[PDB]
Amino acid sequence: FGIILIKAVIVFCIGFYFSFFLRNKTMKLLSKKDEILANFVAQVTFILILIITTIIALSTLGVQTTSIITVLGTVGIAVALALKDYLSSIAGGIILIILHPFKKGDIIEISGLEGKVEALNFFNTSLRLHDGRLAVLPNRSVANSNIINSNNTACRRIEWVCGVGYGSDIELVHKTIKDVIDTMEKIDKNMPTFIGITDFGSSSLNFTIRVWAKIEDGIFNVRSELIERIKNALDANHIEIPFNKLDIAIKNQ
Amino acid sequence: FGIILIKAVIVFCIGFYFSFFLRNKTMKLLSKKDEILANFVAQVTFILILIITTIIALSTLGVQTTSIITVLGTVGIAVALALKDYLSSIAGGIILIILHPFKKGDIIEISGLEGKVEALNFFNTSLRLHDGRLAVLPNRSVANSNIINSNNTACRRIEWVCGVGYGSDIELVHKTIKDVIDTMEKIDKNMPTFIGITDFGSSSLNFTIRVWAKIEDGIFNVRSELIERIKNALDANHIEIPFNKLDIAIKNQ
Amino acid sequence: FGIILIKAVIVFCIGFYFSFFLRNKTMKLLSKKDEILANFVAQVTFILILIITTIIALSTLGVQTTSIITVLGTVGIAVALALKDYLSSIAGGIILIILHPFKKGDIIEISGLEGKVEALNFFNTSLRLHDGRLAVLPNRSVANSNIINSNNTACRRIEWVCGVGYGSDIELVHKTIKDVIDTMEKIDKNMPTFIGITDFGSSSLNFTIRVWAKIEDGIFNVRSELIERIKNALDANHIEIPFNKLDIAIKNQ
Amino acid sequence: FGIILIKAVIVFCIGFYFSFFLRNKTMKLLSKKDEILANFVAQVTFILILIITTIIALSTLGVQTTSIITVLGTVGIAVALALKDYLSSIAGGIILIILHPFKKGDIIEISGLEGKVEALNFFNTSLRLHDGRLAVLPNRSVANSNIINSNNTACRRIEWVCGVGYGSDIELVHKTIKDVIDTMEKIDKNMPTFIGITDFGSSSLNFTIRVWAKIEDGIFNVRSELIERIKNALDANHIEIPFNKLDIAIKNQ
Amino acid sequence: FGIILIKAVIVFCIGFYFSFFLRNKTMKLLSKKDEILANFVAQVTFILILIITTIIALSTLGVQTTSIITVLGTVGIAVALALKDYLSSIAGGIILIILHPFKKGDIIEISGLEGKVEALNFFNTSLRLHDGRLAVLPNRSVANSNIINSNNTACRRIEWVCGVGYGSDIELVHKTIKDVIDTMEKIDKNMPTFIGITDFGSSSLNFTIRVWAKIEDGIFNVRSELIERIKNALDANHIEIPFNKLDIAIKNQ
Amino acid sequence: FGIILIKAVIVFCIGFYFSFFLRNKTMKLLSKKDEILANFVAQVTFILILIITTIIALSTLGVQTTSIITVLGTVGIAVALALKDYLSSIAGGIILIILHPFKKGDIIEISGLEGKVEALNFFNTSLRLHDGRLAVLPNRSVANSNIINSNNTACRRIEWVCGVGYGSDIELVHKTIKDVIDTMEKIDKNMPTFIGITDFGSSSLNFTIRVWAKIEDGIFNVRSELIERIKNALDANHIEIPFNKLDIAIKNQ
Amino acid sequence: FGIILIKAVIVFCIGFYFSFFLRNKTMKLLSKKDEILANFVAQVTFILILIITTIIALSTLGVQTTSIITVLGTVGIAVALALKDYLSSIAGGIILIILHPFKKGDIIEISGLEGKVEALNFFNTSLRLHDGRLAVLPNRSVANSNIINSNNTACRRIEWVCGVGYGSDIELVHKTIKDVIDTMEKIDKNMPTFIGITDFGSSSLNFTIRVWAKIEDGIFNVRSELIERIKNALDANHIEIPFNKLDIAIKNQ
């Protein structure tokens, strides 16, 4: 009866050694990066090569391994699952790096959060915000949301709704602004300006100002000076900016 | 006992070479596009053709490869899974390109974000916004939301709720507007206008103005001038636009 | 040893030709519709018919194809997955077309977005809005939301909360409206009207008007004119519509 | 060598005819319902029975069909997937019809949307709303939300927060209402009433009125008349309903 | 050649009858419940036992049924999937009934919707609301949300933010309330009361009243009467409850 | 021909008995806990042991069981799926009990809902709220949300924004509070206090008060007394807490 | 007939003992950590090694184990599924620990919840909040949200919108602040300051102040003092900070 019975501990041990050489070529070509990693890829690659060796050695004896493989299968599957989201941050980065419509130094607006890019981690992306802290956005997140590059086009629009005296003229202000526009140093004339009465206001009339500028000096800055001159001028032309107006009627009871 | 034992390293090497020719016909008809790409499709196509050759070579020896194939399966599956979303951006595009109710130069409103289209990447779509930065919308997202083409129909409605002296006549204003409508240059007569009292207001009476215009020189221009003349006229007819009215009653305690 | 060694290149090629006749009966009964489509269904149908032939030909040699099949499988699966959502827009339409509670020319209100229907694409659905732009709603989206047909029933209710002098009588107004109701040309008498005091208001008393009308010439027109006469009459009966009333008490400190 | 080689076109054709008899017993006991349906179930049932007979006929030749079945498998799966949601509208209906806590003529409140039921489609459900349009709610949606039957219980509570002069008595009004309650024709006495001061108000004192009534005649009218009487009475008892009170203190600067 | 060819119509019919006895022992121990149910479980159990008999009979002939079983599998799978959510309402109920931290007669607040329980259907749960209509919540929904039993504990807290004259004393009101607390018939002394100044108010100072009561005759009653006494008392101690106070400063322009 | 034909009813019955002994060792070591459970685990364990015995007995006859196993699998799978979420409440608990960063008597804030813990059911978790009712939170929910233990750290911060006469001094109040702080019995000195001007207010200046206290006698009380002293003192130092200030300008029209 | 019949109870028991040695080397290497854990891994590893032994011993008899394995499979799968999310908290942590862009002592802002990190549990993460309670964030959650490290960059921006007399000069305040900036001890000069008129206000004009500071002493104190000096100075320069301005018009009716 003997050869099977022997062929088993022949095989079982033949591979069982190969658990050392592959726990230690795991530890050889990748270990001494971290304790956590050297003993995780050397624990798992090991125990795995082990359980494959056990299953295989029971197979040479003539045992039904269909039952164990069903368990190993349905194990491996809960594993496939834990790492779904992590590995999708990984191939998130793989696709990001490879196909990039984004690269380091650009500034963007991922999901409402705008900052200049600092890092393309294996799984993570890092922004140093205008706040100046560093957000660490997992690649998974990034690769699928609307990535809004601000850097990829050199000029950007600017806007207002500058409330006037609700009683000033359609063209008075239409020229005081058309004048302050020009007096601006930081402004483009090749890019149009749409400055009209946008809407009836509650206590003030509201003028939109659409203007363009260059990415280079602007941020928010240009808008702040634009207003500092459309004040210096609207204040100057005996043109009113109204505090909330209210029409009181009085009656006693 | 020998032939199996030999047929193994026969086979094993036979294919094992074929790891060079397909690491290097991977590197041959695809590489030199990028370091990342050339060593990723050449690392994976390789390591794969390798693990297939090992398994096959152990199969010629008479070994149960059901155990390893179960692991290879349940690996490949975690892989199937990481690339679900990416590859659904890809065939997103494929469908997008092929079936298009959209094409470059059109302006649309994908998910609240309106801009003219600049790019149909493999996975990505790019809009230069009216802001003027370029959003990079993954195809996945696009192929499944409500794509609102503004370009595919030549004319668009415009609207108001123009507040009036809450005491002015139902037909007075009904004609001052029917007059300013006509005096407008940029305005269609073949397309209806619905200008009636929409609602009782809190401090003002509210008139809707529904009007149509052409895509060609419209957007916002038309509406802003429309208002610039419905003020130039409503201001002109001794018709009041009210600041918020309030009926104070007084009593002491 | 020969025959299998030969039967391989027999078979392998036997089918390998059939890669041409099915690359080009792919290109024959389907191509010339587009470059993207003719070379996509002719690339894929091809490469596939190829990898099936390879696998088959290694099978006639006595090679374990379990390893490759497991990869082919786990590939095909990531594919099954990318097209989950697209193909569910497809059979979305299939169901939509087939079982329709909806058909072209009807107006509806899919997910808050109301417009007349213009297109039933294979995947997509198109509405020309009352805006007049054309939304392109993927079938996947439509087939599963509450589809609100406005066209399927000939008559629709209309409503108000018409604020009055908070001091006028429960029946005074109850008759001025019951009078303006009748004087209306565009109104149904077979459909009831529920006009009564709905709620105590903050500065005004609030009357609901529930009235019915016909789809034919309704929408905007009816409700706006109804108000134009319930003003022409309420203004006329020395019945007040109040601006926000406020009871000031005064005391110094 | 012959018989296999022959047994193939034997088999292959044997079933290959059965493509006609099952394209046309598809077209026989089901078609003529529609063009879309007669040629869809006759195209698919067909191409299916075809690809089954191909695979089978290559099987009688001794070919590895594991390759093709893997593809047929992983195809069928993307199909399983497109129709997940549709078919769950179907078995949505099956469970709905079968186990119903709802039936036609009842009025309900599915997801905030209340209307009387008009249809139980195979996948869809239809309500003619109070509005009078007909919503078409897919069975999938319905079978899983909180279905709120209003018809399944004969009596319903009604409510207020009736603001009073903030200075009137805890019992004065507590009786004026207990009196208007009784004077109501449309009200139940074996159903309690909880009419107490519910909350200190900002400018007014707030009384809750909890009352019951019958489903038969209460659509809006009961609450609306209720108030038409609690006005006819509160107005009458020299009990104030206040416009927003405000205690002004004055000081100059 | 005969026996196989015969063993087929032997087998095929042998089971084929067993389609009658199992369409009719489907119809025998389960039917006459409904028409929908008796012909659904008798259609399906049948068609199924049919397609199992066809496949088996082609198997005795030596035909490859790997192709058909792949389709039968991939069908059965689109089925597993339509009934994922329904059958999880079912085992929802199974777990609910079995492990209950809830049973009929208790009142709860599932997902913001509070009512006394009336039904534990197979898949559904029914509440008669304090509205008095009966919601029908599918078991799926219930077994997984926060089920907030109100009935499982005999006493419940009550609360206020009772605005005072912002000028009254920290302890004056602190005793008027400590006095109104005791004078209440419906209150617990073994359960603490936390009545302090909670927050500076905008126009009024704000006092929290935390008090306990018994489920038996509480709900709304106790709080409404508690307030009717803390008004009867606060109104009485020359302690002001203020209408919104405002400090007007005046200057002309 | 016999033995097979006999070996079937040999086997089939051999196990078929074993349906009794395992219906009744189901009923033996588990039943009498409930009727629902004794006849559910005794119905399912049974019918299952039955369908396995049928399939096995047709296998000894030489019948293709691949058909039926395909249905048994694809059934078992719609079952795996219904109990996904229940059994994840289960192993939710298993994990919760095992690795607890939480144990009974702690108070927490799971998803906005804060209460002291009363129960760790198999699947459920119960909190008696500060309300005093008992919520029954499924383990599934808990094991995955941010579990905010309040009990696990002995001291907690407290906060204000205490509005002051917008004209008072930066240090006046800065010391009146620094004094009331000290006068407090219930307060920690080893824990810092950050009491400065946080923000310009609309009608009042706003001071934050950050202070620490002990879990022992605190929560909300210490805050309420803190304020009763910072009123007793701020009221006392001729330091104003302002009612909303408003700067009226007057002009007629 | 014997040997099979014997080989069964040979095998069955051979492994059946091995249920003791692997229930008790489960209990040997792992047990005594807890009762829950020692009898859970010793119950499951056991019952499992048991059901594998039974299936295997019926296999050596010649029984079709395809039916049982289908059930063991489809069981194992509902198990794979319960532990999806838990095990993804596990490999969440594994990836967190190994790849960290985060480490203990850093402060972050995980999903709106900012606190210093105290724990990296196997599954959980713990923050002691500014509040000072300890939140217990499951790793699953963390590894996938935007982890915002505040600690990883040494300097942070600060901001305002400091309202001024709407009538003061564009440069008056532009210098009072540029002066208060400098007078500040805790402020960086190498980091820019953008102090301009950001927007027209309703009752006040609004100045943004963008300034930088150092992580080390800043918190929220540097802003509070900044303001305490921009008050000490703005108050000082006869520069008004306005209470809400309102332009009253009066007319009687």
mmCIF file with all atom_site columns, N, CA and C in Angstrom, chain F residues 144-181:
data_model
loop_
_atom_site.group_PDB
_atom_site.id
_atom_site.type_symbol
_atom_site.label_atom_id
_atom_site.label_alt_id
_atom_site.label_comp_id
_atom_site.label_asym_id
_atom_site.label_entity_id
_atom_site.label_seq_id
_atom_site.pdbx_PDB_ins_code
_atom_site.Cartn_x
_atom_site.Cartn_y
_atom_site.Cartn_z
_atom_site.occupancy
_atom_site.B_iso_or_equiv
_atom_site.pdbx_formal_charge
_atom_site.auth_seq_id
_atom_site.auth_comp_id
_atom_site.auth_asym_id
_atom_site.auth_atom_id
_atom_site.pdbx_PDB_model_num
ATOM 1   N N  . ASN F 1 144 ? -19.569 50.550 11.839 1.00 0.00 ? 144 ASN F N  1
ATOM 2   C CA . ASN F 1 144 ? -19.033 51.335 10.749 1.00 0.00 ? 144 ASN F CA 1
ATOM 3   C C  . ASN F 1 144 ? -19.186 52.845 10.820 1.00 0.00 ? 144 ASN F C  1
ATOM 4   N N  . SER F 1 145 ? -19.905 53.393 11.791 1.00 0.00 ? 145 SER F N  1
ATOM 5   C CA . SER F 1 145 ? -19.945 54.850 11.896 1.00 0.00 ? 145 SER F CA 1
ATOM 6   C C  . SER F 1 145 ? -18.922 55.318 12.943 1.00 0.00 ? 145 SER F C  1
ATOM 7   N N  . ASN F 1 146 ? -18.741 56.633 13.046 1.00 0.00 ? 146 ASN F N  1
ATOM 8   C CA . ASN F 1 146 ? -17.809 57.222 14.009 1.00 0.00 ? 146 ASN F CA 1
ATOM 9   C C  . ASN F 1 146 ? -18.448 57.126 15.365 1.00 0.00 ? 146 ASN F C  1
ATOM 10  N N  . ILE F 1 147 ? -17.919 56.214 16.157 1.00 0.00 ? 147 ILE F N  1
ATOM 11  C CA . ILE F 1 147 ? -18.344 56.008 17.523 1.00 0.00 ? 147 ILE F CA 1
ATOM 12  C C  . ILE F 1 147 ? -17.720 56.955 18.469 1.00 0.00 ? 147 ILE F C  1
ATOM 13  N N  . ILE F 1 148 ? -18.441 57.967 18.945 1.00 0.00 ? 148 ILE F N  1
ATOM 14  C CA . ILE F 1 148 ? -17.818 59.019 19.764 1.00 0.00 ? 148 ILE F CA 1
ATOM 15  C C  . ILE F 1 148 ? -18.015 58.843 21.251 1.00 0.00 ? 148 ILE F C  1
ATOM 16  N N  . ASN F 1 149 ? -17.026 58.223 21.880 1.00 0.00 ? 149 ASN F N  1
ATOM 17  C CA . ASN F 1 149 ? -17.072 57.861 23.266 1.00 0.00 ? 149 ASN F CA 1
ATOM 18  C C  . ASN F 1 149 ? -16.904 59.137 24.022 1.00 0.00 ? 149 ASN F C  1
ATOM 19  N N  . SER F 1 150 ? -17.761 59.425 25.012 1.00 0.00 ? 150 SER F N  1
ATOM 20  C CA . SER F 1 150 ? -17.654 60.676 25.802 1.00 0.00 ? 150 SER F CA 1
ATOM 21  C C  . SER F 1 150 ? -17.045 60.292 27.149 1.00 0.00 ? 150 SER F C  1
ATOM 22  N N  . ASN F 1 151 ? -17.281 59.028 27.491 1.00 0.00 ? 151 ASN F N  1
ATOM 23  C CA . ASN F 1 151 ? -16.881 58.413 28.748 1.00 0.00 ? 151 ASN F CA 1
ATOM 24  C C  . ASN F 1 151 ? -15.408 58.020 28.838 1.00 0.00 ? 151 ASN F C  1
ATOM 25  N N  . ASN F 1 152 ? -14.758 57.983 27.699 1.00 0.00 ? 152 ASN F N  1
ATOM 26  C CA . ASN F 1 152 ? -13.460 57.378 27.673 1.00 0.00 ? 152 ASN F CA 1
ATOM 27  C C  . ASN F 1 152 ? -12.395 58.425 28.078 1.00 0.00 ? 152 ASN F C  1
ATOM 28  N N  . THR F 1 153 ? -12.772 59.705 28.041 1.00 0.00 ? 153 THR F N  1
ATOM 29  C CA . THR F 1 153 ? -11.903 60.780 28.573 1.00 0.00 ? 153 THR F CA 1
ATOM 30  C C  . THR F 1 153 ? -12.583 61.615 29.664 1.00 0.00 ? 153 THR F C  1
ATOM 31  N N  . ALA F 1 154 ? -11.922 61.773 30.814 1.00 0.00 ? 154 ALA F N  1
ATOM 32  C CA . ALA F 1 154 ? -12.570 62.289 32.024 1.00 0.00 ? 154 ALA F CA 1
ATOM 33  C C  . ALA F 1 154 ? -13.010 63.783 32.043 1.00 0.00 ? 154 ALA F C  1
ATOM 34  N N  . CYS F 1 155 ? -12.479 64.643 31.152 1.00 0.00 ? 155 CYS F N  1
ATOM 35  C CA . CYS F 1 155 ? -12.777 66.119 31.095 1.00 0.00 ? 155 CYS F CA 1
ATOM 36  C C  . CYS F 1 155 ? -13.228 66.657 29.745 1.00 0.00 ? 155 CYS F C  1
ATOM 37  N N  . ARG F 1 156 ? -14.170 67.614 29.732 1.00 0.00 ? 156 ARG F N  1
ATOM 38  C CA . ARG F 1 156 ? -14.646 68.146 28.443 1.00 0.00 ? 156 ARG F CA 1
ATOM 39  C C  . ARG F 1 156 ? -14.748 69.676 28.344 1.00 0.00 ? 156 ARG F C  1
ATOM 40  N N  . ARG F 1 157 ? -14.452 70.183 27.148 1.00 0.00 ? 157 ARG F N  1
ATOM 41  C CA . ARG F 1 157 ? -14.492 71.610 26.934 1.00 0.00 ? 157 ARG F CA 1
ATOM 42  C C  . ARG F 1 157 ? -15.914 72.046 26.883 1.00 0.00 ? 157 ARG F C  1
ATOM 43  N N  . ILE F 1 158 ? -16.096 73.337 27.125 1.00 0.00 ? 158 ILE F N  1
ATOM 44  C CA . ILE F 1 158 ? -17.376 74.005 27.149 1.00 0.00 ? 158 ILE F CA 1
ATOM 45  C C  . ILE F 1 158 ? -17.251 75.304 26.367 1.00 0.00 ? 158 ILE F C  1
ATOM 46  N N  . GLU F 1 159 ? -18.342 75.773 25.762 1.00 0.00 ? 159 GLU F N  1
ATOM 47  C CA . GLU F 1 159 ? -18.251 76.988 24.986 1.00 0.00 ? 159 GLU F CA 1
ATOM 48  C C  . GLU F 1 159 ? -19.408 77.995 24.925 1.00 0.00 ? 159 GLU F C  1
ATOM 49  N N  . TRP F 1 160 ? -19.001 79.234 24.755 1.00 0.00 ? 160 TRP F N  1
ATOM 50  C CA . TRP F 1 160 ? -19.811 80.390 24.334 1.00 0.00 ? 160 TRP F CA 1
ATOM 51  C C  . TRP F 1 160 ? -19.406 81.279 23.243 1.00 0.00 ? 160 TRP F C  1
ATOM 52  N N  . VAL F 1 161 ? -20.435 82.029 22.867 1.00 0.00 ? 161 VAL F N  1
ATOM 53  C CA . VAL F 1 161 ? -20.343 83.284 22.189 1.00 0.00 ? 161 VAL F CA 1
ATOM 54  C C  . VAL F 1 161 ? -21.251 84.303 22.925 1.00 0.00 ? 161 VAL F C  1
ATOM 55  N N  . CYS F 1 162 ? -20.785 84.828 24.069 1.00 0.00 ? 162 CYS F N  1
ATOM 56  C CA . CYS F 1 162 ? -21.506 85.814 24.919 1.00 0.00 ? 162 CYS F CA 1
ATOM 57  C C  . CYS F 1 162 ? -21.456 87.269 24.416 1.00 0.00 ? 162 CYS F C  1
ATOM 58  N N  . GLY F 1 163 ? -22.556 87.706 23.803 1.00 0.00 ? 163 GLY F N  1
ATOM 59  C CA . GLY F 1 163 ? -22.743 89.036 23.254 1.00 0.00 ? 163 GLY F CA 1
ATOM 60  C C  . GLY F 1 163 ? -22.658 90.093 24.333 1.00 0.00 ? 163 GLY F C  1
ATOM 61  N N  . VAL F 1 164 ? -21.938 91.156 24.059 1.00 0.00 ? 164 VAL F N  1
ATOM 62  C CA . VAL F 1 164 ? -21.724 92.297 24.946 1.00 0.00 ? 164 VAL F CA 1
ATOM 63  C C  . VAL F 1 164 ? -22.039 93.646 24.343 1.00 0.00 ? 164 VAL F C  1
ATOM 64  N N  . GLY F 1 165 ? -22.221 94.695 25.193 1.00 0.00 ? 165 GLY F N  1
ATOM 65  C CA . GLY F 1 165 ? -22.639 96.021 24.713 1.00 0.00 ? 165 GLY F CA 1
ATOM 66  C C  . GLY F 1 165 ? -21.454 96.146 23.805 1.00 0.00 ? 165 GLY F C  1
ATOM 67  N N  . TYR F 1 166 ? -21.760 96.463 22.558 1.00 0.00 ? 166 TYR F N  1
ATOM 68  C CA . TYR F 1 166 ? -20.770 96.475 21.500 1.00 0.00 ? 166 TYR F CA 1
ATOM 69  C C  . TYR F 1 166 ? -19.715 97.601 21.792 1.00 0.00 ? 166 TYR F C  1
ATOM 70  N N  . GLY F 1 167 ? -19.996 98.457 22.786 1.00 0.00 ? 167 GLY F N  1
ATOM 71  C CA . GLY F 1 167 ? -19.127 99.567 23.188 1.00 0.00 ? 167 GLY F CA 1
ATOM 72  C C  . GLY F 1 167 ? -18.241 99.398 24.431 1.00 0.00 ? 167 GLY F C  1
ATOM 73  N N  . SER F 1 168 ? -18.351 98.267 25.121 1.00 0.00 ? 168 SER F N  1
ATOM 74  C CA . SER F 1 168 ? -17.593 97.920 26.357 1.00 0.00 ? 168 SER F CA 1
ATOM 75  C C  . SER F 1 168 ? -16.110 97.677 26.139 1.00 0.00 ? 168 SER F C  1
ATOM 76  N N  . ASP F 1 169 ? -15.259 97.611 27.166 1.00 0.00 ? 169 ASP F N  1
ATOM 77  C CA . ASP F 1 169 ? -13.823 97.553 26.840 1.00 0.00 ? 169 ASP F CA 1
ATOM 78  C C  . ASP F 1 169 ? -13.274 96.104 26.713 1.00 0.00 ? 169 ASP F C  1
ATOM 79  N N  . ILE F 1 170 ? -12.311 95.947 25.781 1.00 0.00 ? 170 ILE F N  1
ATOM 80  C CA . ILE F 1 170 ? -11.594 94.701 25.418 1.00 0.00 ? 170 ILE F CA 1
ATOM 81  C C  . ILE F 1 170 ? -11.076 93.922 26.633 1.00 0.00 ? 170 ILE F C  1
ATOM 82  N N  . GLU F 1 171 ? -10.887 94.640 27.740 1.00 0.00 ? 171 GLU F N  1
ATOM 83  C CA . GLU F 1 171 ? -10.297 94.111 28.968 1.00 0.00 ? 171 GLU F CA 1
ATOM 84  C C  . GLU F 1 171 ? -11.252 94.191 30.140 1.00 0.00 ? 171 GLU F C  1
ATOM 85  N N  . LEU F 1 172 ? -12.241 95.065 30.043 1.00 0.00 ? 172 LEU F N  1
ATOM 86  C CA . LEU F 1 172 ? -13.213 95.195 31.106 1.00 0.00 ? 172 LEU F CA 1
ATOM 87  C C  . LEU F 1 172 ? -13.860 93.856 31.263 1.00 0.00 ? 172 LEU F C  1
ATOM 88  N N  . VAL F 1 173 ? -14.534 93.471 30.202 1.00 0.00 ? 173 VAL F N  1
ATOM 89  C CA . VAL F 1 173 ? -15.190 92.199 30.146 1.00 0.00 ? 173 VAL F CA 1
ATOM 90  C C  . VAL F 1 173 ? -14.165 91.074 30.247 1.00 0.00 ? 173 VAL F C  1
ATOM 91  N N  . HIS F 1 174 ? -12.986 91.299 29.696 1.00 0.00 ? 174 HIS F N  1
ATOM 92  C CA . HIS F 1 174 ? -11.922 90.298 29.741 1.00 0.00 ? 174 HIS F CA 1
ATOM 93  C C  . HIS F 1 174 ? -11.523 89.948 31.172 1.00 0.00 ? 174 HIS F C  1
ATOM 94  N N  . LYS F 1 175 ? -11.846 90.836 32.101 1.00 0.00 ? 175 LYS F N  1
ATOM 95  C CA . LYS F 1 175 ? -11.519 90.566 33.477 1.00 0.00 ? 175 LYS F CA 1
ATOM 96  C C  . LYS F 1 175 ? -12.781 90.168 34.175 1.00 0.00 ? 175 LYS F C  1
ATOM 97  N N  . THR F 1 176 ? -13.959 90.725 33.827 1.00 0.00 ? 176 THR F N  1
ATOM 98  C CA . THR F 1 176 ? -15.224 90.322 34.535 1.00 0.00 ? 176 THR F CA 1
ATOM 99  C C  . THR F 1 176 ? -15.460 88.823 34.371 1.00 0.00 ? 176 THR F C  1
ATOM 100 N N  . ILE F 1 177 ? -15.217 88.348 33.153 1.00 0.00 ? 177 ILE F N  1
ATOM 101 C CA . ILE F 1 177 ? -15.231 86.923 32.909 1.00 0.00 ? 177 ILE F CA 1
ATOM 102 C C  . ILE F 1 177 ? -14.059 86.236 33.610 1.00 0.00 ? 177 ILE F C  1
ATOM 103 N N  . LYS F 1 178 ? -12.823 86.733 33.484 1.00 0.00 ? 178 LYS F N  1
ATOM 104 C CA . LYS F 1 178 ? -11.696 86.081 34.182 1.00 0.00 ? 178 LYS F CA 1
ATOM 105 C C  . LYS F 1 178 ? -11.955 85.981 35.693 1.00 0.00 ? 178 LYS F C  1
ATOM 106 N N  . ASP F 1 179 ? -12.861 86.814 36.194 1.00 0.00 ? 179 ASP F N  1
ATOM 107 C CA . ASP F 1 179 ? -13.237 86.823 37.600 1.00 0.00 ? 179 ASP F CA 1
ATOM 108 C C  . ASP F 1 179 ? -14.354 85.819 37.856 1.00 0.00 ? 179 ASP F C  1
ATOM 109 N N  . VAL F 1 180 ? -15.383 85.803 37.011 1.00 0.00 ? 180 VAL F N  1
ATOM 110 C CA . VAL F 1 180 ? -16.486 84.857 37.193 1.00 0.00 ? 180 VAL F CA 1
ATOM 111 C C  . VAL F 1 180 ? -15.994 83.415 37.031 1.00 0.00 ? 180 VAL F C  1
ATOM 112 N N  . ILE F 1 181 ? -15.021 83.240 36.146 1.00 0.00 ? 181 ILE F N  1
ATOM 113 C CA . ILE F 1 181 ? -14.347 81.958 35.938 1.00 0.00 ? 181 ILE F CA 1
ATOM 114 C C  . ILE F 1 181 ? -13.853 81.397 37.264 1.00 0.00 ? 181 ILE F C  1
#
